[PDB]
Design an enzyme around this catalytic site. Structure first.
Site: not given
Ligand SMILES: [Cl-]
Ligand SMILES: [Cl-]
Ligand SMILES: [Cl-]
Ligand code: NA
Ligand code: NA
Length: 129
Positions: A35, A46, A48, A50, A52, A59
């Site tokens: 990750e 991301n 959308d 958002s 992380d 998220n």
């Protein structure tokens, strides 16, 4: 902070992640490796909108507040920046909520795709724990 593999394993153990909801420590280390490359400061946006955050790439759509993810939740009740700290406590505490929410570690795409079904104990091999 960029953790060493065994350093992170030991920190995660101390924070109660070993076997948490059944997931052995190597799962968590593997997830963090893929990750974030063990980097607490990792961020990734991301599609959308958002983002992380942190060693476990938590998220902002659901888990933390970053002030720029409209309509999102903050289920861990934390600013997302707290997930970037050298101290992994906030990330771990929030990860425990995530992993408990019914989907297990499948919440972490890198875990699904790169750790699940592999010899995750290799990730803690050699570490003094
Ligand atoms: Cl393991
Ligand atoms: Cl927001
Ligand atoms: Cl599970
Ligand atoms: Na965001
Ligand atoms: Na994190």
């Amino acid at each position: 902070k960029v953790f060493g593999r065994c350093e992170l394993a030991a920190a995660m153990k101390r924070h109660g992640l070993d076997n948490y909801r059944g997931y052995s420590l190597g799962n968590w280390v593997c997830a963090a490796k893929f990750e974030s490359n063990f980097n607490t400061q990792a961020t990734n946006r991301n599609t959308d909108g958002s983002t992380d955050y942190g060693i476990l790439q938590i998220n902002s759509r659901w888990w933390c507040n970053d002030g720029r993810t409209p309509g999102s939740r903050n289920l861990c009740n934390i600013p997302c920046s707290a997930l970037l700290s050298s101290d992994i406590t906030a990330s771990v505490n929030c990860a425990k909520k995530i992993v408990s929410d019914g989907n297990g570690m499948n919440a972490w795409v890198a875990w699904r795709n790169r750790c699940k079904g592999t010899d995750v104990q290799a990730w803690i091999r050699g570490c003094r724990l």
